[PDB]
Amino acid sequence: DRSRVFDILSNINIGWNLGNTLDATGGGNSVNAETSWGNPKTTQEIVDTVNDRGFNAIRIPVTFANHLGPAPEYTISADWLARVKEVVDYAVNDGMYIILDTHHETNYWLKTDPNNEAALCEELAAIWKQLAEAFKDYDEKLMFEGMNEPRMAGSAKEWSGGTPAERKLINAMNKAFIDAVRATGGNNADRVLIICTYGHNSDEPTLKDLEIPSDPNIAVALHTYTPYFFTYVADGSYSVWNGSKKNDITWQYNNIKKYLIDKGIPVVITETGAQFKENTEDIVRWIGDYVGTLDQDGVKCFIWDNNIYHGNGEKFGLLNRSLLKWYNDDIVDAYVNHA
Ligand SMILES: OC[C@H]1O[C@@H](O[C@H]2[C@H](O)[C@@H](O)[C@H](O[C@H]3[C@H](O)[C@@H](O)[C@@H](O)O[C@@H]3CO)O[C@@H]2CO)[C@H](O)[C@@H](O)[C@@H]1O
Ligand SMILES: [Mg+2]
C-alpha cells in the first residue's frame, strides 16, 4: 500500500526546475558553480515568483561532483552544502513541495559500468548519507531524487535505456540510494524517495527491467520530452502541433500505466517541456495534450526551466529571473492552469 505517496503528490499543482543553476559544473569547488552557466544567484524572490505563478512544487537539480572531497568519504564541501540548504530553504519558507536530486554526476563519477557497481553504489550512498543528515529535520514536502539520467555517456544506447546489465546496475544503485537515506533516520525514514530508470527513459524494455523496491514510500521518476522532435531542435524537428502526434504521447503513457500506475506505483515526470520555436500557440496545444494525458491519473510533472529564451541555446526558459517576469505568459498559463 503506497497511498501515502499518492496523497502527498496529489497536493502539487505542477512543478518547475531551477535548471542550469546548482547543476552547473563550472567554478570548481566553489559556490560560483551556481552562476557558472550564466544564471544569476538564486534568490528568495525568484522562488516566490515561481510559487506565486502556480508552480507550488520545485525541483532543485544539484551537481555535487566538483564539491566532493576525495574517496571514500566524498565529503561535501561545507560552503556548497550550506548553499544548497539556502536554496531548499527558499522553497520551505514558501511551504512548497521540493525535489532535491544529484544531477550531472554522469559527467564525472556516475558512469554506468556494471563491473564498477560497488564503487558507484558506495559513492552514491556516501553523498546521500550526508544530504539525508543535513535535511534530517525537513518535513514530508521535501523529497529526494537519487540520480539524474544515470547512464553511460557516449554509449550506443545512452538515450534509449542502456543495456540489460546496466539496468540491473541501476536497480542496485536505486537500492543503495534508499538504503543510505533510511539509515540516517529522522524524517528520512518515511520521506518520499524518488528513484529512476536508466537515463530516466520510459520505453517498455527499460520499464520491464525496473526493480520496484518494497519500501512503500517511494516514487518512480521519468523524463519525457515527448515527442522529442517537437520539444528539441534537431534534423527532423518540427514546431507545429496539430495533434497528429498526440499518439506518441498516448503510446508512451500506456507503458507507464502498464508497468507502474496500474500496479499502484507512484510516478512523477521530474522533467518535461518544449523549447521555444516562435510557436506559442502550438506549445499551448502540446501542453493540453501532454499534461492532460498525465492528468488522467493525477500524475504530476516538473517543467525544465534553464532561463534561456532570447539568447542562444536550448530555449526552455520561462521565468526571466533577472526581471522576475515570465518570458511567455500564454505558455505559462497553460501549465499552471492545466487543471
Ligand atoms: O531524455 C532526456 C534527454 O534527451 C536528450 O536528447 C536525446 C533524446 O532523449 C533521444 O530521444 C534522442 O534520440 C534521437 C537521436 O539522438 C537522434 O540523433 C535521431 O537519430 O533520432 C532519435 C529519436 O529516436 O537523442 C537525443 C540526443 O541528445 C537531451 O540531449 C537531454 O537534454 C535530455 O536530458
Ligand atoms: Mg517522522
From CA 101, how far away is CA 245, in angstroms rounded?
31
Tell me which residue has its CA closest to atom 28 in ligand 1. Answer: 159
Give the DSSP letter of residue 72.
T
CB 269 within 8 A of CB 299: yes
CB proximity list for 233: less than 8 A, separation 6 or greater: 275, 277, 314
Looking only at the bridges linking them, the beta strands covering 57-60 and 97-101 are parallel
Looking only at the bridges linking them, the beta strands covering 57-60 and 319-320 are unpaired
CB 112 within 8 A of CB 152: yes
Exposed / middle / buried, residue 80 (Cβ in 10 Å: 0-12, 13-18, 19+) = buried
DSSP notation for 103-154: -GGGGTT-B--GGGHHHHHHHHHHHHHHHHHHTTT--TTEEEE--SS-B-TT
CA angle 312, 37, 110 (to 5 degrees): 115
Cell of 223: 523524463
CB 196 within 8 A of CB 147: yes
From CA 8, how far away is CA 194, in angstroms rounded?
13
Tell me which residue has its CA closest to atom 20 in ligand 1. Answer: 235
From CA 193, how far away is CA 70, in angstroms rounded?
26
162 φψ region: left (φ > 0), alpha (ψ -120 to 50), beta (else): left
Cell of 245: 502526434
Give the DSSP letter of residue 68.
B
Cell of 273: 517541456
Q: Sign of the CA dihedral 139, 142, 145, 146?
A: negative
CA of 148 to the centre of ligand 2 (A): 27
Tell me which residue has its CA closest to atom 16 in ligand 1. Answer: 159
How many residues in the chain?
Answer: 339
What is the C-alpha end-to-end distance of the chain, expressed in Å?
27
CA of 198 to the centre of ligand 1 (A): 14
User: From the CB of 149, is ligand 1 less than 6 Å away?
Assistant: yes
**Type of residue at 148:** N
CATH number of 1-339: 3.20.20.80
Q: How many CB atoms lie within 10 A of CB 190?
A: 14
From CA 174, how far away is CA 158, in angstroms rounded?
18
Catalytic annotation present for 149: yes
CB 233 within 8 A of CB 157: no
- From the list 145, 149, 158, 166, the catalytic residue is 149
CB 309 within 8 A of CB 32: no
Interhelix angle for 78-93 vs 117-134, to 10°? Answer: 60
Closest CA to 86 of 147, 43, 137: 43
From CA 23, how far away is CA 65, in angstroms rounded?
10
Q: Sign of the CA dihedral 289, 294, 300, 301?
A: negative
Looking only at the bridges linking them, the beta strands covering 319-320 and 325-326 are antiparallel
Closest CA to 40 of 310, 274, 324: 324
- Domain residue spans of the chain: 1-339
From CA 339, how far away is CA 334, in angstroms rounded?
9
DSSP notation for 17-53: E-TTTTT---SSSSGGGGGTTSPPPP-HHHHHHHHHH
From CA 54, how far away is CA 76, in angstroms rounded?
33
From CA 56, how far away is CA 14, in angstroms rounded?
7
CB proximity list for 328: less than 8 A, separation 6 or greater: 276, 280, 309, 318
> Which of 151, 155, 159, 203 should be mutated for ligand 1, with most atoms under 8 A from CB?
159
From CA 283, how far away is CA 190, in angstroms rounded?
38
Q: How many CB atoms lie within 10 A of CB 7?
A: 9
How many angstroms is the resolution?
2.4
**Residue whose entry in the numeric block shows the C-alpha cell 564539491:** 67
CB 67 within 8 A of CB 60: no
* Torsion angle defined by CA atoms of residues 132, 137, 143 and 147, in that order, rounded to the nearest 10 degrees: -10
Closest CA to 24 of 57, 59, 61, 77: 61
Q: How was this structure determined?
A: X-ray
From CA 160, how far away is CA 151, in angstroms rounded?
10
Helix intervals (H) in the chain = 3-10, 44-53, 78-93, 117-134, 164-182, 204-208, 228-231, 246-259, 280-295, 329-336
CB proximity list for 210: less than 8 A, separation 6 or greater: 167, 170, 171, 197, 220, 259
